[model samples]
Target chain A: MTEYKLVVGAPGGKSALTILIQNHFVDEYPTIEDYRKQVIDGETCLLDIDTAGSAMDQYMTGGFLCFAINNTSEDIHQYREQIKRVKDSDDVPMVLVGNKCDLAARVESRQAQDLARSYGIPYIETSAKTRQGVEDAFYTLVREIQH
Target chain B: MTEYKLVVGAPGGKSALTILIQNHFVDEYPTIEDYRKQVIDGETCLLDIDTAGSAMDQYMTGGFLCFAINNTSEDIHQYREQIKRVKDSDDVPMVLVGNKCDLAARVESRQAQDLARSYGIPYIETSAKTRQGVEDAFYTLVREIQH
Candidate 1:
């Protein structure tokens, strides 16, 4: 069996990963937290690290890096501060996420999609409250970690 | 100022166009309706025709065709049934819009985005209630009508 970690680098609180692991939403979550999740219809559970500090910067092999799009239309995959900051494998499974679809969206879908395209990473819009796109988020991360 | 008609071709009422033009939500809008909407800061006073019938099939030049993503993740641009039927300009500034973001999303953003990609058209998500992507929707359609 293979193993990996789900790392969320969102602004904070009930992040993309937490909302998926906990199956709900919260106003403010935590930094550098941990959880265990078993992929549905798949074998074995993986470590879900809700990182806000150091760990995510490095030590991320066989990991799915979640770059939550709080909101931005940037230059050169501008949302990739962590992508540039972290010293992980040259290639990691990264997914651009726009959480909070249940609320008013400040960022346009094209801009977010464009940012994803700029990063050459996949993008997905999700709602922590509605539980939308959470499964796909996990699955893509799962599938991509295979890379 | 270049004048053009705003035509919304969705599954039904208060569609992607009406919701933006009218700025609200209704369970069932209308079919083959007409309204006059003046573009903001735009001198062009255009005819907003909510066509659900014969007109949309042919008469669509100088028009912004709104092929709304009611809830679809289709095959071969499968959402283009009307797109194929409406033998207008092959390039009618088609926009793939996913309306009704206020409710629980039955469709994933990636699927919708993929569908839009398949059509090689721009994709946007909007909420009739909050009026979130509505402005961007009109602007994209407006800008593309220039094409």
Candidate 2:
């Protein structure tokens, strides 16, 4: 059976908003060269969002992207709420991307990785413009979702 | 009398920071080409802070080079402090940049320009990497101080 793939995050509106755009605006790139240079050449599309530092609010295009109210850090029942949000809509195979990975220091990477691993989620680090580790970051996600 | 001419911002700060650096680092550039092409092409120098954003910071040098504090923000007071640290010896003549002028959709340029004007400082906008207004930005200050 073909699995439905999704990239999901905190209860932000963009994922839902992108689907609403009718056009490929969410997938539209900054410059054709930007897309070409980064994805085709640099090998990472997330680089653009991360590079612009607006990554906190944007995401890469996949089959489906979702945001849940439970993604809130302080919400005590966030997990249950998150599961409900996920199940209520569509049951796609979900891949969680803990965005803002670069906001922390090297010491934080280990903890972040641990958390992601505990959740059975994947993690990757990224920084735009310079395109640091962005290729491997998303590739890991794509790899998991593909098979 | 001689004035200190420098570009004050991140060598690798965000685009807005580049403008801030352009504003105070030096004052006007003469032409759009000068503003855009020549500055990063080896006509002038940039003084910026260094941080872990260090990976790409190396490229900050080739054109005119000086690395100071890294990271970018909107607070002008920090800019003042940067000037203070660099001016430990004395106040240098430099342009005031309110970078990411493009991001100033909400912020008014007139206020920033007036602040620079009130301080009897010269001002200009630039994308250090793009060389956009870079030439005009650098030499405008160079001409003011060099003269």
Candidate 3:
């Protein structure tokens, strides 16, 4: 079995993302403050690196990278530089996740998709509250990593 | 960041338990054949050790223990000795998970609870397909570990 690490780049979505995963897997979702591990798809291991305060260099060197952006915020485009920084290595698979799609006032799906296209990565819209596209977002990245 | 490992003892429920976790965490869950790593709860790292073919002596020394039993099977009581073997150490926290609860034919929940009581461990029923009690099973173990 191969273990995979996912560095989640979300400004303030850690709690919500954490809850979404915990809802599915139960107690396996712990915060990065403790550097805990969780199983995904029973084939790979998920190690989380939160990019809110830490420098992405340590976590971004290797493994799968996921950028979780607040879909309700218009600053989604600002992550282009961060995505580019990870792409500079060009070894790991990168995914852009538009989180919090369940919110009424939100960024348009087209905007998120367009940003993803500009960066040449897959874009997925997810609502951690409604459980919409949460699994899909992570699975899409794993598929990319395997590819 | 604390890393956690789970050694699963299951005569036939390994694959089902694996799928249950993978469904929530995506493709990061791996079998014990590779001795891989995963993330749990975004903080702890999860390591996998399958005790079907290997000696429990190797994996049981450290980390959390989870016994996956087929809920519908009549031989659920057979694991008593195996659980006792680990309990003798009294260092590792163990959990009893009744897998395949979604099946029409299943083990009585009270029987599993009673067995868990005997071992002084928490009991949780899980269905890999429907993904029931999977997280609770893991969470219970983590709580015990923290305790």
Candidate 4:
């Protein structure tokens, strides 16, 4: 088992990332319990979420892989730039996230899916507001973290 | 009870505009709920007093009137600028706001107050987070809108 750090985006976006971190993926296994437990301690994990407007990207403090992507074209392009700008020492894993599936327009859904695949990134579409896909997104990231 | 737009300016400068708005008139109001109810019903009450960063002026949309004045060294000069710049829009009552009140340790309160009187714009120094003048500052302006 390896160490895992959980980073979730603020709710009301296109994803269920917050639910996965708070409840569903915390007690999967004995070994993983310790992994999750470490994060619950608060001091061990550097957990954060984006809350303010897109300009709040000012807080993108680059060191670890920050997973967050949405239907916003500006956000998607900015994330690409953020990834490209990461320093070698600060490089870590990043999970692409698209949230709010229940109300996703057809146009946005197709674009998000294609962007994720073209970027060679693991994608998770969720709805934190409705608790949809929240669990799977967390576990997928947890697996990546433990790997 | 006049359906008039109240335009207040500094006795002369930015600081005065802040003090005029920061006046303690809201304390006389019976309760906050009464104020909220009145505004929600759209009885010609004030709009929500939402604060944004000064940088947001760059993004003002069309039809959005930017009745802003530069900070002048003298109160009379500041008042003149505000009066000249303010629009005669009767749809919404205009209230002058002098921002940045908490920095009094670095700025002068008397000077701010003096300018506020010069323009007859109610002056108030407000700290957005402490919820300090948040309620009162809003109530003062909305009162003109109410009638």
Please compute DockQ, using alpha carbons, for every candidate against the native two-chain complex: 0.03, 0.01, 0.02, 0.01
Strongest candidate by lDDT: 1
Rank candidates by lDDT, best first: 1, 3, 4, 2
Interface RMSD of each: 13.1, 21.5, 15.9, 22.9
**C-alpha lDDT of residue A135 in model 3:** 58
Error of 2 at B53 (Å): 8.0
TM-score leader: 1
Count steric clashes of candidate 2: 34
lDDT by residue for model 2 (B1-147), tens: 222224334333333334434444433322111122222211234333212212332232211211111223345545455445534523445556544333323244445545555654544543444444443444434423322
Residue-level lDDT tens digits of model 4 in B33-106: 11112221112333321111123222221111111223432443443443344433323333334443434334
> Over the stretch B1-147, how does candidate 1's per-residue lDDT look in tens digits?
446455454443335446555676665635553565663211234645455534444544434545333445242244255555564334556566666665653565566555555655656666566665555455545534524
Sorted by TM-score, highest first, which candidate order results? 1, 3, 4, 2
Q: In angstroms, give how far residue A27 of model 1 lies from its true place.
A: 3.4
Residue lDDT tens for model 1, A26-115: 665345544666532122456545555244345444344553344552422432565555543356676666656556534655565554
TM-score of each: 0.43, 0.28, 0.41, 0.32
On lDDT, the stronger of 3 and 4 is 3
Residues A5-83 of candidate 2 have per-residue lDDT tens digits of: 2333333223212221132224233221122112211112332221111222233333222222223333212432455
Give each model's clash number.
Answer: 4, 34, 36, 34
